[model samples]
Target chain A: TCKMSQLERNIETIINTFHQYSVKLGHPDTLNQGEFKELVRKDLQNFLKKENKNEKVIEHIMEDLDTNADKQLSFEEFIMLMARL
Target chain B: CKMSQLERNIETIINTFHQYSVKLGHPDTLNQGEFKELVRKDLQNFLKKENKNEKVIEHIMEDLDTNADKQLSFEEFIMLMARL
Candidate 1:
């Protein structure tokens, strides 16, 4: 593959990572609760060490992120979570 | 340097902001022209219309300038990237 710019590669990684988890279960474009928690526990270990181990924290975060009250996280809402970090 | 994925991504964002923010007066903030140049040159691939419509760019700048200072701080700039 061609060498990607730092920003370009990172952006792709972020987008791809979101999709990787979002498609694991229902709603190909969104992430269910289980997928969201798993992503935080695995991909966000360094950033969210404490919360990753605490189901309550994960629940609260998911609740806070589910802006549309759909119980699933869309990429736009997920981006807000990422931006917060 | 050794860095995690998240750390590397954040670092690239900070470095990219600094790269453009330094092009004009006040290296900490981006003026209108600097903002325009950065979006057109660096972000065009993701934001195809960013450099196309002057009004759209103006609206974006207004939305991003949370402090209403007419200059974009790195935090505000990053929010734009987050949205994209």
Candidate 2:
């Protein structure tokens, strides 16, 4: 019954890396709850456009990352994902 | 060197789309200001199970798609991520 396996170790590392990025991104006080949501969508859209403009590419990325499938990217999901990549 | 940049062109539609999706999906990802982070970790854990478990992919995909959009389809996946 090992606690942290090699894969787990890797994931932990990924999570830690994400932590650092999260801290870097930190919380934006300027962005209130509603504002935060708007900013997140705006930021994600900008990022996607700047980086992946291909409709197919954008759609695929959205599909995978857009857990909600509503069409918008949540701040937490967006930020955490931004941190991941 | 005129006309809107490719980046700016897609900005409108792209931004609008995410907003709509977020609306459909539980707004939970925004409340704690870390729902995505929580779900992603959960997703990762679920994914591990997915590989080993017979229904892992589906399970993991379920976690990936909050609205159960039927997997991270080509329209919104990172299939060509590394390349571009």
Candidate 3:
């Protein structure tokens, strides 16, 4: 009766949102500050309860989710963002 | 349209997790009982009907609960989705 179940679509979001921006810049497999900021400000603005363009908030979010201090987020780190919110 | 769909799906995931977590242990995590029941309640199709066995659920929880805390955090839950 459907194309995808809610769980299926929900699960797919992890990847769907990932490559949407990750592929647009730099390594193409990771998310740089630009990609991450754009992703959140646009795709996640609703969930974050604001327009999300503030650099301070973006920096705070990147700091919380980034591991290994790469200053860029690999898939592992990207998923961690989803995990928290 | 596509972006909106994915964004809404993300909301669905978090809201669904919160809906069940509030009914169980911590409001931020999923205990074994809660995870098991969530799969039955709304995720019956994701893992499929045939894999809904006791052993399967246990292994899934084991894989997701990397901290071995006997509860799946939201981060842990996302790992399961990624693996699937």
B61, model 1: CA deviation in Å?
3.8
TM-score pick, better of 2 and 3: 3
Q: Itemize residue pairs with steric clashes in candidate 3.
A: none
Q: Candidate 2: DockQ?
A: 0.05
Better of 1 and 3 by TM-score: 3
The local distance difference test score of model 3 is 0.77
**After best superposition, candidate 2 residue A29: deviation in angstroms?**
15
The sequence of per-residue lDDT tens digits that candidate 1 reaches over residues B2-75 is 44575567657778878999998999899888888777777666766666886787788889999999899876
Model 3 error, position B43 (Å): 3.6
Can you write out model 1's per-residue Cα lDDT over A1-85, one digit (the tens) per residue? Answer: 2444566667777778888999999999899999999888877777777787779999999999898989999877776675466
Q: Give each model a TM-score.
A: 0.71, 0.26, 0.80
Could you say which candidate leads in DockQ?
3
Correct interface contacts retained, every candidate: 0.15, 0.02, 0.48
Better of 1 and 2 by lDDT: 1
